[PDB]
């Protein structure tokens, strides 16, 4: 799994090679970048043939997207051998109630998160990497910033809590899993309530899910950060944007439309790669920003 | 004790426990056939203007020396020290009773750490389960002591029986839900104190609230007692009826409702012919399913109590 | 100041001598015990002559009551030389807005408290001893128990808080001091609000009072108990009652009506003294309880 650097979205062999040439740590194989996905009806997993061509074209890791909760799409990506699967909200959600139970898979997953509650639930489900996102395709960095701020402030507050108070937070975060059970009971003419000792997700009862989230939260509390790699995503369009996210605590960044939707892709890609690596060196970020050309509209 | 506590209780079942205020009454109770006596300075009917506390240990000892049957005594709810005193003088069983003036508004005595067995009152299943988890070796489905009106005792036994009948139709997961609801009463103090400090009246389930136990641990404890109740179809301890038993028919009625025995306070010594009355209630309790016997011992008993 | 034992209320030389004979650690000189005070219109400080006679009659410390907020009554007790002044709610309150500013006096004060908020405010004002009371004159121990329970549970919860959270509690407790200022502003046609930097009690602003309560609360947090001697009071009528309060954490007990309103005062007084000293010895409490006679009605 990738621990740092820039992950770029590519839609063909030429873009993947450019990404690898620019210094990307990995590429995200998809048929259409986020910006274009949002003209477009139902966005699904990309054709395995396209993903395999990109895999053959480069030496760095290749990732692919699958719809939220779409277990078979994920099993397919795992079968063709992608390095990491991204259960993304960029594509059209397939299961309105649950995300894939990622722990059962061998291939690692990266999941999006808007806040600590989402991150913890995603990590408990098995995510090996979190991408704190706001909204891809906009080219507006405010998205990623809002959520990284929310993520940092929540972890800072969690560190001031006793374990008992953290358990209380875990109990609050677990409630989302019982939405289906409550809706069903109501549909059967009964109160929209659930017993904490009845199975609701992958055989786990609400009480067991609470304990699972609690353990993840205790690690977050101990580390002062998420227990898995955390990249910022959505809105990164300039070298300064990438450097901003790194200063906010990100371990790396995802770039989709920002590069291939700009005037000089290869040039801008190198610059974002440089700014991410030298995020605390204003002169370098400044230099790589000179004469980059038109950025994505957004 | 553990096994010794329930051991004593099983030997009093099917009998009548009578309240006595002196050697003469205690003796009358014994010759009448009581299985045991409850020593106290004033019967519940008289208790109900001032503060009713534990009886002078000297009076209890005099009664213990006057009769060969076991002797019980009352202590105020939550009064750990009164209970410790009664245990030291050697009573056979302590009754943490609501007939006396409650001493602790938040908690009942933690009975499990005592050697002597306790009998506690209960108006419904929730109360019985909490008293039992606290250590009660015996339960008395109380009513309204001092009124001579059996309706209170009947109401609560009806509530107890119906709740147990509904509990048996539940899955273990559903029973846990009931245990969770029953445990909330223990967090009252914590919530009130938090509010007094300017914060939401809520509590964390892993913070200690009673005798070092957290809400979470209390729920598991109540859950285990409820499972026993479900398995047995009744309380896991001896359950006597108490309240307004004033006639032989009243005692027989409670037995038909499922009571293991009865407590009689004012109904005997606040009547015209104590000894005769006591004898009739004893026989009616032993032969609650014998209309002819119940009728027979009821004839020419004289005036009863009222209230 | 007294640190343990039994403080008894006496109304004459004979009772004081009995109290001293029984083993009291100190006596409370007053014209009428709490039980009788409540037939009775306005209850005030006792005649200095009666207090001086009791002082001469015994060798142990003598205390006297003064009305809440009655500074001159307190100065009088201090002038005749009482060992401790009890600003008690048993007497008719003299100042509806504030308690005496006890720090200015040389003689120590004992104040009542129903909960932690009251204890902290009283201690900040200068109290050298707190009596966690419920309601004297009733002979019903439930009063003292309720408040000792509230006191213990509040201190237990305070120990689980960070200093920042304790400051929040101090801020909440300080509000009571601004009641006068708010009432006055409203009477002048303006919003019932106050500025935290305006003087409201003894030259102290709300902000300074908050800091004062905060410091007291930090000591409570550090010690796991109040920073001054704490006796239980109100309702103690039997040796078992005294022993109960000691098991609940009290450093000692106050007894008023319980002794001289019973059948055998001297006998019952000795027994309560013994139970308080041997509160963890059931056999002794049991033995001293035998044949005590009639206790106070209540
Ligand atoms: Cl979620
Ligand atoms: Cl909780
Ligand atoms: Cl439940
Ligand atoms: Cl992080
Ligand atoms: Cl209860
Ligand atoms: Cl039963
Ligand atoms: Cl106050
Ligand atoms: Cl202000
Ligand atoms: Cl204390």
């Amino acid at each position: 799994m990738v621990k740092h650097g820039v992950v770029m979205d590519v839609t063909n062999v030429e873009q993947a090679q450019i990404a690898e040439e620019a210094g990307a740590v990995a590429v995200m194989a998809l048929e259409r970048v986020p910006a274009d996905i949002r003209a477009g009806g139902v966005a699904r997993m990309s054709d395995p043939a396209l993903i395999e061509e990109i895999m053959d074209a480069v030496s760095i890791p290749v990732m692919a997207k699958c719809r939220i909760g779409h277990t078979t799409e994920a099993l397919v990506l795992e079968a063709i051998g992608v390095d990491m699967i991204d259960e993304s909200e960029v594509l059209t959600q397939a299961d309105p109630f649950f995300h894939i139970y990622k722990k059962k898979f061998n291939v690692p997953f990266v999941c999006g998160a808007r806040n600590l509650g989402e991150a913890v639930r995603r990590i408990w489900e098995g995510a090996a990497m979190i991408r704190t996102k706001g909204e891809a395709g906009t080219g507006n960095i405010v998205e990623a910033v809002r959520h990284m701020r929310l993520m940092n402030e929540a972890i800072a507050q969690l560190q001031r809590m006793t374990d008992e108070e953290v358990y209380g937070v875990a109990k609050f975060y677990a409630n989302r899993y019982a939405e289906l059970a409550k809706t069903v009971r109501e549909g059967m003419g009964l109160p929209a309530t659930v017993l904490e000792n009845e199975p609701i997700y992958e055989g786990f009862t609400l009480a067991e899910i609470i304990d699972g989230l609690y353990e993840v939260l205790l690690e977050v509390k101990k580390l002062g950060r998420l227990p898995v790699v955390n990249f910022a995503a959505g809105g990164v369009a300039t070298p300064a944007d990438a450097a901003l996210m790194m200063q906010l605590g990100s371990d790396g960044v995802f770039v989709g439309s920002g590069i291939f939707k700009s005037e000089n892709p290869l040039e801008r890609a190198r610059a974002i790669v440089e700014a991410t690596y030298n995020y605390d060196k204003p002169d370098i970020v400044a230099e790589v920003s000179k004469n980059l050309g038109e950025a994505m509209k957004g």
Side-chain angles (χ1 to χ4, degrees), chain A residues 2-298:
Chain A
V2 301
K3 269 69 175 184
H4 53 31
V6 179
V7 176
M8 303 179 192
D9 289 5
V10 294
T11 63
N12 58 57
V13 171
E14 188 183 304
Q15 302 189 332
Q17 286 171 168
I18 284 178
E20 177 176 53
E21 177 66 9
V25 70
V27 300
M28 179 77 85
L30 65 181
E31 309 179 322
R32 300 189 286 77
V33 298
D36 295 307
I37 297 181
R38 63 187 305 170
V42 183
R44 317 186 180 79
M45 159 186 79
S46 293
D47 178 343
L50 180 164
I51 303 172
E52 297 184 318
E53 302 188 310
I54 293 180
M55 289 174 71
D56 292 311
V58 303
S59 304
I60 59 178
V62 175
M63 295 183 207
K65 293 185 163 70
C66 78
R67 290 178 276 175
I68 295 296
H70 209 311
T71 314
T72 52
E73 270 188 347
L75 284 166
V76 164
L77 297 173
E78 180 180 62
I80 64 180
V82 299
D83 301 297
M84 181 164 249
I85 294 179
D86 180 16
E87 180 173 31
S88 182
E89 33 288 307
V90 171
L91 302 185
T92 309
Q93 195 167 316
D95 187 322
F97 301 114
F98 307 116
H99 279 59
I100 295 170
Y101 185 54
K102 295 163 287 290
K103 289 187 175 172
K104 269 184 166 58
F105 291 71
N106 291 310
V107 66
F109 285 69
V110 55
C111 293
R114 289 147 53 188
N115 52 61
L116 184 61
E118 282 184 28
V120 167
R121 287 190 288 276
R122 235 81 295 149
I123 291 171
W124 176 68
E125 290 159 5
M129 170 182 241
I130 291 292
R131 70 180 184 298
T132 297
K133 69 158 56 291
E135 200 174 311
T138 68
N140 187 340
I141 199 70
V142 78
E143 296 297 352
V145 178
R146 178 190 298 284
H147 299 297
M148 250 309 263
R149 286 293 197 186
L150 283 172
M151 192 67 66
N152 294 335
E153 180 56 32
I155 295 176
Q157 287 185 28
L158 190 75
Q159 298 184 82
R160 304 163 193 160
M161 301 180 169
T162 59
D163 291 352
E164 295 83 5
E165 300 176 310
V166 175
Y167 184 85
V169 174
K171 186 188 300 181
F172 183 68
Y173 288 161
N175 290 306
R176 296 285 271 278
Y177 287 103
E179 196 61 18
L180 174 63
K182 292 177 185 176
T183 299
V184 162
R185 231 171 80 97
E186 179 182 299
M188 293 175 84
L190 298 165
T193 58
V194 305
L195 298 173
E196 64 174 77
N197 295 299
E198 290 295 354
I200 53 178
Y201 181 68
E202 292 289 334
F204 290 112
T205 65
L206 181 60
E208 299 171 326
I209 293 174
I210 294 174
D211 291 335
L213 304 191
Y214 174 57
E215 287 304 313
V216 171
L217 283 166
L218 287 186
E219 284 309 297
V220 169
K221 176 183 171 184
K222 180 180 69 176
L223 301 172
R225 58 157 291 155
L226 299 180
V228 301
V229 175
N230 186 190
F231 276 34
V236 181
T238 68
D241 287 333
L244 177 57
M245 297 319 301
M246 293 308 288
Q247 301 215 312
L248 288 174
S250 305
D251 299 325
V253 300
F254 274 88
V255 185
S257 312
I259 290 178
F260 295 111
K261 275 300 185 63
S262 68
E263 183 179 357
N264 305 310
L266 170 53
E267 297 60 52
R268 181 174 292 281
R270 284 183 178 296
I272 291 182
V273 164
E274 289 305 309
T276 303
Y277 184 69
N278 300 292
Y279 72 86
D280 200 56
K281 272 64 201 304
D283 292 338
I284 294 180
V285 180
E287 181 52 53
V288 306
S289 298
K290 292 182 186 177
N291 295 110
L292 269 189
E294 305 290 61
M296 70 177 277
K297 183 177 175 58

